[PDB]
Amino acid sequence: LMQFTLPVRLCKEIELFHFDIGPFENMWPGIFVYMVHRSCGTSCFELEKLCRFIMSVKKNYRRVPYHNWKHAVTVAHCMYAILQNNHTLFTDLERKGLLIACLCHDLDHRGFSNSYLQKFDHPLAALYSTSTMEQHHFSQTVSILQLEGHNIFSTLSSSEYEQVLEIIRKAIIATDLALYFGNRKQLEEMYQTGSLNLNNQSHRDRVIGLMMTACDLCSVTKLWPVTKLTANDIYAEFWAEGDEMKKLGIQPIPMMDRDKKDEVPQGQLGFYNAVAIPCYTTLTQILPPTEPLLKACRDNLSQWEKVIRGEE
Ligand SMILES: Cc1ccc2nc(CCc3nc4c(Cl)cc(Cl)c(C)n4n3)[nH]c2c1C
Ligand SMILES: [Mg+2]
Ligand SMILES: [Zn+2]
């Protein structure tokens, strides 16, 4: 059969956590398929269906600075790296569902936060009172799965199918950062009191949620220039949201106020300390082979420290 392969530098570097998928959009679908094939198998999906699914997914991301198709493929690659470094800890449905969840997790994002949707009073905020965007993303995922010739899970039983979609739903909801804090605390407590049990489905769920946050934040685990340049895209969205807040006559939070450009290095520090480092710490405790993510995050915190000290 037909193996996907990649040029040598990509073939080797794609295995690493800090891999950057590059500026060539047209290679991203091939990169994704390569990853599905090695982490799941060449038999997981019918090639024609999968290609058709990928292209509809891509069509349904919008051209926003950060929450775009490149972000989806990046988040899927980090999940790939995690799965490949812990290959025996995951069921076959999980391998199947999680890369798909990652590719789908921000479908049809508009570049605005849940909080902005609520203040604007967007129709999505009446349809979904919490995790507004994330329920929308899962909803779009189901839509695409139901298009003719797009059912990549056709080979599964009714019940396996329901299990995979339920893995996907939960993985996608977990990318709501508001939910991450409580989830990481629970996981911390269970690991430390020795009660963490991966045969317990609700424990697995929590562990998979933290994986999702880890993959979704993975721009803080890249080479410094990738990290630094991605941060620019991240703020370009947040500041456009800030302007939109001001348009509604509401003072935006400092994160989203472009008048506070100067405080970026400091906001990054808070963010690495409150969110990123704890995320990768607990992930490393639970899944030791993911330590390179923690190590890279700490390297990048150290770089933001240098930016503050005027050494950059
Ligand atoms: C003035 C002020 C106050 C509070 C702030 N908090 C930040 C962090 C923003 C942020 N958010 C994210 C997310 Cl959701 C993902 C990733 Cl991967 C990254 C790297 N980031 N970074 N900046 C702040 C500023 C400038
Ligand atoms: Mg999201
Ligand atoms: Zn995301």
Q: How does the overall form come out from the CA principal axes?
A: globular
Overall number of strands: 0
- Helix-strand category: mainly alpha
Biggest sheet, open or closed, and with what strands and sense?
A: none
In whole angstroms, the N-to-C terminal distance is 51 Å
* CATH superfamily placement: 3'5'-cyclic nucleotide phosphodiesterase, catalytic domain
Would you give an account of this structure?
Helix 4 (69-85) packs antiparallel against helix 5 (92-104), helix 10 packs across helix 11 (201-216) and helix 11 runs antiparallel to helix 13 (264-286). The longest helix is centred in the C-terminal third of the chain and has 24 residues, at 224-247. The N and C termini lie far apart (51 Å). The protein has a single domain (27-309), classed as Catalytic domain of cyclic nucleotide phosphodiesterase 4b2b (Orthogonal Bundle). Helices cover 63% and strands 0% of the residues. The protein has helices at 8-13, 28-39, 47-59, 69-85, 92-104, 114-120, 123-127, 132-145, 158-174, 180-192, 201-216, 224-247, 264-286, 291-308. With 312 residues, it is an all-alpha fold. The chain has 14 helices and no strands. Residues 71, 75, 105-106, 175, 216 line the site of zinc ion (ZN). Zinc ion (ZN) is lined by residues 71, 75, 105-106, 175, 216.
